[PDB]
Design a protein around this ligand. Structure first.
Ligand SMILES: *[C@H]1O[C@H](COP(=O)(O)S)[C@@H](O)[C@@H]1F
Length: 252
């Protein structure tokens, strides 16, 4: 207790209750997911990581959960993001025809949660969980997000949008989950264009961040998949959301 097994936070307080309540709310709000048995979903979720070493999790562990959480999403209305989760979600709460991963069942369940089990008992570990960098990368959380992100990116078609954080050192970071998983699972047969929306953090920062070296890197990487590239600066995120809420406004 003065010395925990892992470096990361333990399983989120009330994790079982929260996942279960999130599943109920989601399936109540979204009519297409009425066939979902939320107890069977929790049980599949559990079976992925309970009684398993939290540094030996595989995508296979999550396949029963992936099967139960299978969902058809409008393929042409997908919004990916990297390092700017809050604005992405604020956007999709207003622009209801667009979807982030966290607007799907599986993403909604797990959003902002941490969890892990123990190899030597059947208990959930509420004390600590492996950190991706400091402990091990094949942990329950990281493997979950890799698995579901890959599927989501594979489902995308037509014009796919991505929100990127313009305030960060690497606006596009090839070592991020977006750069290492999502980008390399956009299907060349289906995706026409990836359009980046670069969100500015500064008020007086009116650089064209679509000419940033890392954006050119993204453009170049994507061209190999025969995917076109487009980029837009969002100079004023607060004005952006205002315009999204009130699009018939003249100034928008
Ligand atoms: C796939 O990647 C994005 C965010 O990951 P990151 O670039 O901030 S590390 C999520 O939509 C999902 F995890």
């Amino acid at each position: 207790r003065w010395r925990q097994t892992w470096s990361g936070p333990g399983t989120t307080k009330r994790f079982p209750e929260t996942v279960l309540a999130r599943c109920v709310k989601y399936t109540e709000i979204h009519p297409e997911m009425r066939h979902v048995d939320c107890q069977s979903v929790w049980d599949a979720f559990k079976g992925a990581f309970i009684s398993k070493h939290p540094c030996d999790i595989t995508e296979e562990d999550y396949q029963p959960l992936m099967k139960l959480g299978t969902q058809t999403v409008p393929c042409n209305k997908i919004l990916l993001w990297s390092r700017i989760k809050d604005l992405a979600h604020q956007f999709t709460q207003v622009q209801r025809d667009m979807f982030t991963l966290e607007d799907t069942l599986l993403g909604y369940l797990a959003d902002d949660l941490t969890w892990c089990g123990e190899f030597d008992t059947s208990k959930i570990n509420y004390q600590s969980c492996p950190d991706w960098r400091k402990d091990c990368s094949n942990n329950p959380v990281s493997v979950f997000w890799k698995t579901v992100s890959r599927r989501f990116a594979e489902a995308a078609c037509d014009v796919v949008h991505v929100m990127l954080d313009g305030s960060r050192s690497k606006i596009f970071d090839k070592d991020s989950t977006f750069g290492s998983v999502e980008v390399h699972n956009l299907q060349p047969e289906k995706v026409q264009t990836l359009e980046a929306w670069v969100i500015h953090g500064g008020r007086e920062d009116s650089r064209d961040l679509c000419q940033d070296p890392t954006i050119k890197e993204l453009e170049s990487i994507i061209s190999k998949r025969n995917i076109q590239f487009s980029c837009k600066n969002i100079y004023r995120p607060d004005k952006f959301l205002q315009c999204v809420k009130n699009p018939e406004d003249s100034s928008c």
